[PDB]
């Protein structure tokens, strides 16, 4: 199921507390934060919360994290290209005994590109088989505040981010039906401008064996709980600081490093354990190209 | 020290009526500036002839300067209006003072006697 | 912008040299436009300002063509836009006088941006 967020306002994101300041880190909005906001709205409306809810991280509309096979033609530019139906043209021979070092040959032409896995990329145009793309840059501001009882005693600062329409995939539930606007950010009761959630057409994506684009920061296994095994993993390491309930005591702030978002992993088998989509991770999917947003 | 405007000890207000003896002609700063009258008209506040406060202040200052120079005293002097090196009073070791500067002020010191319209 | 264009057209009309003059003086004097602005400020009435500029034109103290253009422009304007237009006219006239720009240079410039292009080049 697809959702739409007509944000068009200044909101915050992952903060890096420094002394007493706060700084923007992720140019996008992480699934955990969204899920927390959407569940807080449910709690406000009713209070009965459910942990079976999963929502993909939202990204600016018509944008997507970058993967390895979507590099930038310039070593310092922001213009990205890739082949139509690349993953079908890629993969495939993964069934065959084809050397991976030969598989990841990006020298389609002279002056071969350099990729930046996990960056916000905006679709641009057709341009025959090689689709035009552009890196996404957002607007940020600084909001500093004073502390009084008439007379200053301390100081604080914040960094807000400007976003256009936002899109994300969630779980089919009445929660989104009964929730319309969600306070999002570090300061939920101070600093929000405008927020809303729009339901749109249902989305049916298939998760099965084969090369899959890990939208969320996937993790192969945790605490020995094996989720899936991958032939070859292409991406980057990430650090996860989120929330998950294990029913009984405790169940907050579990820190476990993971794969960076947009990493390419060739998984050939899964497991039937407690899926980590509600924990905001493991939102892989099979796509023909980045045009899967359509 | 003649810059005692910070501490106000006494204030006196002089209220009276000025009656011209001869044909008083207003300053008419409206030089070749007709508003609702023939030729060059005298200035007026809402069709009411008004003696400019600046004109009275200038005449009074000229009279005071003439008096001070007639005093012919070392302790009291008058400095030129265009001069920027003048000072109101000098506390050098008994000092010099400027009577017009004391009364109507200078660049270095504001006035002490306000004149209304 | 558009008011700027109107004002610069007025200014280039007013920069026409006054004939049979000992000195190469503009037809319209700075004191005249200053009086226009001051009269508009004191007398908050567009019709009275129109009468003032008409009288000044009849007094041979401002250009007949410039007076015609001013009357046409301010024929049906409010006060808030009128004062802004007069201020812009004052600005552009002062710029022309200070820069020593002759009429033959500006000639018939219609857009303020072209005028500032000329000033930047010159």
């Amino acid at each position: 199921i697809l959702i739409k967020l007509k944000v068009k306002g200044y909101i915050t994101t992952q903060m890096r507390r420094i002394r007493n300041y706060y700084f923007s880190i992720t140019n996008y909005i992480p699934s955990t934060t969204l899920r927390g906001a959407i569940l807080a709205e449910y709690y406000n409306q009713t209070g009965k919360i459910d942990e079976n809810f999963y929502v993909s991280p939202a990204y600016p509309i018509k944008t997507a994290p970058a993967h390895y096979f979507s590099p930038a033609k310039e070593r310092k530019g922001d213009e990205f290209i890739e082949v139509k139906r690349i993953l079908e043209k890629k993969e495939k021979e993964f069934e065959a005994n084809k050397p991976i070092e030969e598989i990841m040959k990006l020298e389609i032409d002279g002056k071969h590109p350099k990729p930046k896995i996990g960056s916000l990329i905006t679709y641009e145009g057709e341009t025959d088989k090689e689709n035009k793309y552009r890196e996404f840059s957002s607007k940020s501001i600084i909001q500093m505040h004073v502390a009084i009882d008439s007379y200053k005693g301390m100081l604080f600062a914040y960094e807000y981010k400007e976003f256009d329409e936002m899109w994300a995939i969630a779980s089919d539930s009445e929660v989104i039906d009964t929730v319309k606007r969600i306070k999002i950010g570090r300061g939920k009761n101070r600093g929000n401008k405008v927020v809303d959630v729009e339901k749109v057409r249902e989305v049916s994506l298939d998760q099965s064996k084969g090369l899959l684009y890990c939208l969320s920061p996937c993790i192969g296994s945790l605490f020995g709980k094996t989720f899936f095994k991958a032939k070859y993993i292409i991406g980057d390491k990430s650090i996860y600081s989120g929330w998950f309930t294990v029913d009984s005591f405790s169940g907050q702030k579990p820190v476990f490093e993971t794969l960076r978002e947009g990493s390419l992993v060739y998984v050939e088998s899964f497991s039937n354990e407690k899926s980590l989509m509600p924990a905001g991770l493991n939102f892989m999917l099979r796509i023909s190209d980045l045009s899967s947003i359509l | 020290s003649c810059m005692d405007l910070d501490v106000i000890t006494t204030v006196v207000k002089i209220e009276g009526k000025l009656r011209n003896e001869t044909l008083l002609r207003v300053g008419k700063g409206k030089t070749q500036d007709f508003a609702e009258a023939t030729d060059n008209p005298i200035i007026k506040y809402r069709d009411r002839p008004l003696i400019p406060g600046s004109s009275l202040k200038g005449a009074f200052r000229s009279l005071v300067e003439s008096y001070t120079k007639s005093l012919n005293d070392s302790k009291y002097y008058v400095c030129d209006l265009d001069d920027n090196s003048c000072v109101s009073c000098e506390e050098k070791k008994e000092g010099r003072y400027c009577i017009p500067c004391i009364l109507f002020g200078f660049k270095d010191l504001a006035s002490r006697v306000y004149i209304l319209d | 912008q558009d008011l700027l264009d109107i004002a610069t057209r007025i200014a280039i009309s007013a920069i026409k040299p006054k004939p049979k003059s000992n000195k190469p003086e503009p037809y319209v004097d700075s004191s005249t436009i200053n009086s226009l602005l001051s009269f508009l400020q004191s007398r908050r009435n567009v019709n009275e300002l129109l009468l003032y500029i008409m009288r000044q034109a009849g007094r041979d103290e401002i250009d007949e063509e410039t007076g015609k253009l001013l009357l046409a422009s301010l024929k049906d304007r409010e006060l808030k836009d009128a004062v802004n237009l007069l201020g812009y006219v004052k600005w552009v006239y002062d710029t022309l006088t200070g820069l020593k720009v002759n009429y033959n240079n500006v000639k018939g410039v219609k857009t303020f941006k072209e005028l500032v292009n000329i000033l930047s080049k010159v």
Binding site: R16, I18, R19, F23, S24, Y68, R75, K76, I100, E101, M104, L106, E107, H112, K114, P115, I117, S137, S138, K139, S140, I142, M144, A157, E159, E162, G220, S221, L222, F223, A230, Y232, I233, I234, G235, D236, K237, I239, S241, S250, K253, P254, V255, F256, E257, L259 | - | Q1, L4, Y88, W91, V92, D94, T95, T97, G98, L99, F112, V116, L119, S120
Partner: protein, 829 residues
Amino acid sequence: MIRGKLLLPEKKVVFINESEVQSLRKDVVDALKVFSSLACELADNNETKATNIFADLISMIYKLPMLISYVPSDKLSTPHEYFFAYIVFRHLVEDSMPSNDIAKLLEILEEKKRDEIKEVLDYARTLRKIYEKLLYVPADTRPGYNFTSLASHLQLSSILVWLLQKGSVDLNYLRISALLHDIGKLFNPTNHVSESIKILDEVIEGSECLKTNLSRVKSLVEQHHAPLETILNDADRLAASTDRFSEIVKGALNNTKIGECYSLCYGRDVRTKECMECLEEYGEETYSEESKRLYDVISNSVVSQKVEGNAIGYLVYIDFPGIQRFITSFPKLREMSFASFLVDFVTSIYSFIVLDQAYYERTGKKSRIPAEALLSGYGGHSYIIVRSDFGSKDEVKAWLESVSSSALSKLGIRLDVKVADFAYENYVRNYKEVYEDMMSKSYERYLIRDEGKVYSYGLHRVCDNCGIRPAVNRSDDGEYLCETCNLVRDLSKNRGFIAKYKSKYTLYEEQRIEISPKEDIKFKLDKNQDPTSYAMEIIAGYRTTSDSRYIALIKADGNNAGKIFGNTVTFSEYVDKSFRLDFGVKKMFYDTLLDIMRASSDESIKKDLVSRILLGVLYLGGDDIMLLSPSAIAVPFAVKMFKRSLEYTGFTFKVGIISVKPDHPVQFAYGAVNALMEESKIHTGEKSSIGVLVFSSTLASEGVVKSDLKNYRKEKESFLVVSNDVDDVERLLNLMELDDFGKLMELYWNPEEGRKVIRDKIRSLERFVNYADTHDFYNTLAYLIRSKAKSEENSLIKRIIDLTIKGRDDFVFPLYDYYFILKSIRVGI
């Protein structure tokens, strides 16, 4: 007797004064004697140890910047000093330095601190003179072959000597012989052999201990003449032929335009006398013209020869795949400075030590990696060569990666090793192909596997995660210390910025002048206060705690360097260009310091300012420049430094300058200033660019900079040029009477009058910018023209407006730029 050097990319030929080089020959011989005596002193009546030490010192002669810092320091503070100490004392010890620990390695390097460093630094001035001379003299006086200087050719000669050497043939003797041969070629191309013989004789007459060894070297060089059949001369000749690489190109022969000396000076045979006689025959102007023509043809000429045999050597690229997270891990200035130093050290010196140990044990303690094998290794990127005796290049890469991972498994620092074939037996590949191979063998970085762990997000709070391990360690200030940050703080407690403060820098010139920050900084602090805590304030310029003053960040980078190095004819040309860039950058910084020193004001003020500037240096050299000078002197410093950038290095520089409050976080300021520097790039690229942006009451970040530039700055009607030519800023400073350092320092040391003077100078421009903020572009321009119109003659306002308006093509006018340039100095006091 005429020799001229071809410069690039300006394509200018400069001839070398023969008197100057003939005068410096005496200093060269004196330095050689000094180094021989020092090697004898260190060897303690030993021959092998003395041989190794003398070889290392002679290599240091040809590589001064990589072994001697821009400003010599009696305290080990730069990676170059550590590298020099290591290459010196590695032969002194009979036991290998343990590379498994980095803290112990640094402790050992600090312990190996003797007066040898001071003795070398005493003659470092003459060493710098000789290095400059070698950098400014072409390797081959033949026109068209003069585009490569002597330093690059000499380094390639030493590299080829170490590589092509094989069998029981002595290598240290061969190295010294080749280096002396090249020095003789410098001093006398016609009789380089005889000049080398004279040099050897003078050195032997100098050194008392090394008598039999050097006599044997001289006899081997002499008796084994070039026409005579001998292994040493064969190896040396083949190495030189591979180094030149240009004689295998028939373009110069087919290009017979002049047709007078191509038959005699050029051909199979070489005679320097014929070339010199021809040079007068046609004259240098014509010589320079024909050299330019030949170089253009060669650059337009493409050849492809591949030796079917193996590759005798490999080039190893060491870089950091991801520095943003590591840099952002440090919020304080001292921690960030130590982190930058540690990153550079790990990239260059640690890798060199690991490879040196591997090679030394590979042979069985027989040979050792020459000190000159380290080409790059400042700023993070490092090019290191290896001999094709370790075996598989991928095997070497895996070994280095495993060693690095074992050493830095806790610092979060992982090095990406890139190895490509360096040269063949009868062919050395150009830099473009090598870089192509490097970039091709880059997918291997992107392959990773799954690992489960816990690392505290930044260094804050006590998370829960997996509870088997203990929580985040408590801190002396409370709870703000992660284990990795705790270890880095422990490492930096002894060495780092505090070491720089407790040092004594000396400027060796016509009058040696020393700088002691412990005695030069005027920051009155109680003995119970910690200078490292107030390091940012000290660099800012707080003369007392009750002081308000901004601090500026200066970051510089070359323009279009990657493609420039891609379009390089030969590897020697690339090495020469890199050496020229680095040495010119250091020369510019040193000359700016000298200009500050000569200010005709009180010596205390200039000493304090120089001390603060030196302390506010993160890393300088090559394409990476970082500076934290005080705001009151920053912009004029940058202008004076980069006015002659093309003259010194020949590379245009994009420079971004910001000015944040001392309490501002350092990593985010670094990111923002990097973004500003990248944005302030001249599209033409023929001129340097300086961007100034003051953060008065707003924090700085890369995103904020991007948003502000996208909002206010534009390409049609803008007041924020950002990409500002240096000469424009120079003219602005001259108009404001701020170019002179004496006036700047007079304003700086006395804020009582300084604030008033700068406010008087800046009030009119501030009013103009205010009205700019009031209305739109057209209205602002109208008001600017009005202000210009109503300005009396010989006033400053008319001059400022004319400078702003005139010379601007589009409706783009530097007004915010000039305002911020003035505001930097305004807030500096």
